Paper text:
For cryo-EM, we used an ssrA-tagged green fluorescent protein substrate ([name]-g3yg9senyalaa; ssrA residues underlined), a single-chain [name] [name]∆N pseudohexamer, and [name] [name]. Classification and three-dimensional reconstruction of EM images containing one [name]∆N pseudohexamer and one [name] tetradecamer generated density maps of [name] bound to one heptameric ring of ClpP14 and 7–10 residues of the ssrA degron in two distinct conformations at resolutions of 3.1–3.2 Å. As seen in previous high-resolution cryo-EM structures, subunits of the [name]∆N hexamer formed a shallow spiral (labeled ABCDEF from the top to the bottom of the spiral in the clockwise direction), which docked asymmetrically with a flat ClpP7 ring. The pore of the cis [name] ring contacting [name] was open, as expected, but the pore of the trans [name] ring was closed in both new structures.
Residue numbers in the entry:
A (entry chain j), F (entry chain h): 2 to 8, 15 to 195
B (entry chain D), L (entry chain E), M (entry chain A), N (entry chain F), O (entry chain B): 267 to 275
C (entry chain k), E (entry chain i): 2 to 8, 13 to 195
D (entry chain K), H (entry chain L), I (entry chain M), K (entry chain H): 2 to 193
G (entry chain n): 2 to 8, 15 to 198
J (entry chain N): 2 to 198
The structure:
């Protein structure tokens, strides 16, 4: 069950949504992604000048769902400040680094994991070649976007994404994935 | 023989 | 889980609040129940204001064809112009609905993707029944290809050659293919 | 379990399983659903028998609920290839592929027991995939249906049109009806 | 079923009513969803009054570490002093959150039982990938031990020796181990 | 489903909660125990001088969950009157006898069973020894508390808990688990 | 689904509860029994002088749950009128006969079934003996209460409960298990 | 069950299973889906037969729904390695691997029964993993497809381009169609 | 099923299963996944052949997708322990463990068929448990990977660095590519 | 499938399965998890070999991931009982019970192949029930652990304390490491190079 | 798999199974759980051995986790019936039924290996149904427990009271403890 | 012979 | 014999 | 012999 | 004989 609060009656997540706070928890699927997209659009309609806050704790998921969230964040005017709690996986990290420049934060004991896409197909050799080329294009597209936000060279990203690479909050900052760390609310 | 068509006495 | 919102005091879920803004979401596999829901939303919006354009966001891996046809026929039946938007991906039925939007109001996001392929079906039974079902799916394939060629502007022959197998297309490729009109890089720009 | 029998010969007594003993008397059994492995075994027996004596008639006993078509065509072609007349006998029942093999026997050597039942129907199949693949498979099974009907018509002696009308759905034939339908030649009630 | 309470008069559930009194519950295995819920509750309480202390009751057999770190980071991040109370038992990640409470506000009921152990994990794949995941979990183990030593006051070496295998501690043992501060036998007494 | 009472809409359990009645039903577990703990805290907050009533009908369960309820009952200022309906198992009996002295009652046909803890572990011999000592300490601690509330000697409790021991309402009174038997509300 | 009625926002079962009517349907478990117990206490607190009505259609269940309901009915002051609809099983019959004297009813086409307790245990011989003795005491206690509520002799009950015994509405009346039959409301007008 | 037969020899009577008796006559049966274990067994039989008489032609009877490729390539290579001419015969059906083996028989010694059906299609496969891994497997299966098409074109005489167009999707062929295609030299309608 | 063959000898006729007849010719078949039981069986055969005639060569045919490493090491150590030169042949495919056994054969006696495919990749392992235990197992698999690479470099003759770079991910090799790599000495295109 | 082999004898040709033929050469195989059935078979084989020739050495090849202890103790006791020297060889891997049997082989006749791996760890077990029964079972397994460690120290020559420290967690050892640890004596790099047999 | 052995008698060679050869030497194996089939087999072996030589001692090796009691009683009754002294040996472990059969051996001929373990506990059982049926089954198992304890005390020499106290819960005993407990007679460390 | 290609009397 | 009890040459 | 490496007439 | 009732030498 989810607790409710009175402010008539609001859900705990709905109450925070009033404060422009969105949560991205669990594996990234199409339904949860669509929900996050709806929240962004709703917040944009209310006030397109106030920054949005997106907290991320996720082990990754589908790429199409993630790209919808990424394209949406870049489409709307509000600066989406991404925050990492617990962990950011390949898609979570992509969304984390996709936040507004200077507004991507991570908590001290958070972690980040970047890896190349995963996929697969079963069928004729012809169909395999098609699906194979697509995922490679996806890998290239993701790497290009990561390089743009992080500021790292494309070649460096390809070398670091060939296998699962883990990064702590300080390492992520040096890697350009985020901007700073939030030890305490008052300090920042 | 042993079958159906086979003849036996 | 779906969060509520406020707009006296009224309780609205996130999806309903957007519906108030003439925004519909087509997410997940296309089945009959979700399709019926989308159809209901279109009709409700038409009754409220039959002159304001509707927005349909599409993120789907495809599904049943009959369900999709109901949505397609409904969009072409009502007066409002149904502007389709692609987020994440559009599959064969999603792409069919995407390109089915109002001319000049079909968009795709920059990193979206599109996949068009010929129908998939199977039947087990007597050879006679097999022939019937086979002919039916072929007619469906022809009907779908004709509509795609009409909306995209391409030739029926080109569509058949490209739909013989799964063909992937990015937002720019889809535009050049006539499948959509433009790309929504940012709200302010367009 | 399969019982073992003894055969008295000039060299000495020999131990045989019941099925092997009947094979020595040119008797093959086609029981159960038709499949590649059983059909392959039947094919081997026919070839062995032909080499042993290509002038003596072979006997095939059919109690089948039917099965794969390809596995049946191998048996059919093998029967129509070898020189010996393959006398088919129906015990218990003959299904679509059993009946096809039954009527495929030598003219005048296709028997049926009085209480046996024969069922004929059109092929069964299916496929799941793209529309293009469906068209190929659908065309193929139809050709199989046509080929089967032609062969049934030839052996039975019925017109092709009549066979198509009677195979559109499952048709059950008793031993007397089968004789009138050309599927068999006579009935075996008692030993004369 | 969750009972309800009435407080004009406003309907409430038992857990929500306690939330008005700045009381949170961390029950069951520590997963991502429940953790996100706890994190949301802390932020909401902070916005209401960032000067009043929060109370977190802990009865849990542990769980994922990433989820626990989010809660731990959030407690440190916010201004209110999060008083951790142990009821039932505190496992490896329950104990970590318990000892992470504000100094002097970490309590444990008399019959409670704490358990500390090194992290758990695993991976299946190539040898190269195994080395990566192995190094990662070791860094996690080192990081967890450092924080435990900082909160408990013990030495890093002692923590490493005591976490190599499951170590159980009662309420008094936890106090001497610096994991908690005192015990709560009666409300009036303390 | 649960019936609804209008008074505002109250579920039947909430209405009884208004009268300071708490129901403990089914096997004990962290989630049900947490709910009971919340109810006790809420009632104490609403009124810290009125007695609470806890009806017990359960086949027992986890001990950690039970200990939280026990510690909470002995921690809050109000006196928790325990009542046994249908049956009380080892954890249920422990909670039953833990009620306020003179406020623990049993119905005439209720049955009480006391047994020693149940636990298991699979692993290395080293880890096995650890878990074995722990459960043994728990058994000793449970027996100490049982002897304190019942008033029976610790040695007697060990002999009677070595195996499942059943007790009716009268036997429980003689044993000291419950102060008295409730036959009629007006009579008592 | 459960219908709703306005008089406000009451489900069909609660509205009947307002009329002091409780339903005991399905197998007797701990949760449903606890629910029934809550209803009785609520009704008692609302009006401890008005009679309560308990309709019984059940194939039986746990005995501990049944005892909680039984003890509660005999504990509260209101007279709990039990009614049998469709069927009353071993625990259902025990609760049926436990109603207020002269207020136990059964519909004409209902059926009652009484049998001895069921149980079992797997383990050491020592533990088996304990559980075996316990269930026997339960069987004895149940028979004593049945004989008290029915007026029959303990010996007769033991003989009749050794195996499943079925009884119709008339048979139950002669067996002392109920008091009368409810053919029509206007023909009896007991309420 | 498998029947046992008796062989009359100079030394004395011998008991053989039907499959082994035919092996003595240089007949090998390929049945069921192709796999490592069955393919290994076929390889062993070919080698044994070669040693006995490396001049007498071997006969392979194929009734298969197809299977693994590697298992088939071993049989293909073994046939092209040994000196004896491996006369392939199709009974019932030949699938993609069966067809490849069927057309891999010695030129002029590839036969089909009249009702047998032959299907040729491109390889099937799949992999799940990282994109880098997927690229490796995709290239590999494509090379296999290319290699298979080249061999098919060499045996059938058809151009490589034609084979690619016909193998893009499942293509069915009857005994006559296969002859014109070049998979099989002739048909065994009846014994002569 | 396994066919039975007859061996002609001066003293008398003998009946053997096809696999045993080949074993009599110092031929061992490695098929299917590499497990402990099949490996034990292969090891037993090598010891028996060694006792019979140590001087004569032993042939090992490999058609294996992959398998356990410990089992493979037993086979590898046994081959390098006995005196007979173990000539390895690749039929269908040789995977990481199969390739390791293939390249481990006697120098100049390692052959592959033309269409056979060889794959090599680093070991696969998994462990679930405490971080301490995880570190121990992780170190062990790395040492195994290093040891395997060292042996691969020795038999192939490639540098250790090159082997590590090529084994980081699945690498497929055809018969010709394998020859240049050094896994196999030559190819058996046709009998001579 | 198990291949069959022919042995030439004065009476005539004789047919054997490959495992039985090796048994005739005093060779036993301990493959797979150690259970009661396989152990009895090994025990039966050792007794049979002892009667045939109680002076000729027996060879036991070990490729096993371990298993039950009781089943292993039977084999250990049987080896230490019979007169023949049971030369243990490690192929592929030896787990805790496999390694225990390997070290149990006759002194100077314990071998390992170069790539073989040996793992030793403390016993595994568990029980579910009352606290009383848990104490009984927990005590029993500890006695087993103590007894096993004592035997390992006796065969390897190491100290009981060292064994306890090294068995607290899974410890892997290669052929050379094992030789220095006392688990084995030498390494069978080649049959004729050493000629130990 | 079960190995085959050879016996070299003056009459000639004879092929035996390892278990059968040992039976010829008056050795029986009681391995695995005690069920009805294995027990019935053991009974047959004892009777066969008794008839061959009713004066020579029989040997029964025991490695078992226990099982049904009825099955064990049949073995126990058979051992006490036959004239030969049944020398029981414990290898690996003896469970409650195994221990019962172990101690039931002939006085002075009950051995245990050094590292073997023994476990004695009271019977296990259960029933589900009416209370009447429960009481019946409960009384029966209690009688069984009493009967088993009496027999254990008779063979072990201990007092019935002590046995009841020690069997209330699982009691483990090593070879030395068992000797002191009268459960066995001596230990077999080495061969003299 | 016995096969198809094989000739018979 | 062959067992433990049995003596060996 | 019989294998590949084995030579034949 | 060999059974129970059977007598032996």
């Amino acid at each position: 069950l989810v607790p409710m609060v009175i402010e008539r009656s609001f859900d705990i997540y709905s109450r925070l949504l009033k404060e422009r706070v969105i949560f991205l928890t669990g594996q990234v699927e199409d339904h949860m992604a669509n929900l996050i997209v709806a929240q962004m659009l709703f917040l944009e309609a209310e006030n397109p000048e106030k920054d949005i806050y997106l907290y991320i704790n996720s082990p990754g998921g589908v790429i199409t769902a993630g790209m919808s969230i990424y394209d949406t964040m870049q489409f709307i005017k509000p600066d989406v400040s991404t925050i990492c709690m617990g962990q950011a996986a390949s898609m979570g990290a992509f969304l984390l680094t996709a936040g507004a420049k200077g507004k991507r934060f991570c908590l001290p004991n958070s972690r980040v994991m970047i890896h190349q896409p995963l996929g697969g197909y079963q069928g004729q050799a012809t169909d395999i070649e098609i699906h194979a080329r697509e995922i490679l294009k996806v890998k290239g597209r993701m790497n290009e976007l990561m390089a743009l936000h992080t500021g790292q060279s494309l070649e460096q990203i390809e070398r670091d994404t060939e296998r699962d690479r883990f990064l702590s909050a300080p390492e992520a900052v040096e890697y350009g994935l985020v901007d700073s760390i939030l030890t305490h609310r008052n300090e920042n | 023989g042993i079958g159906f068509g086979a003849t036996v006495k």
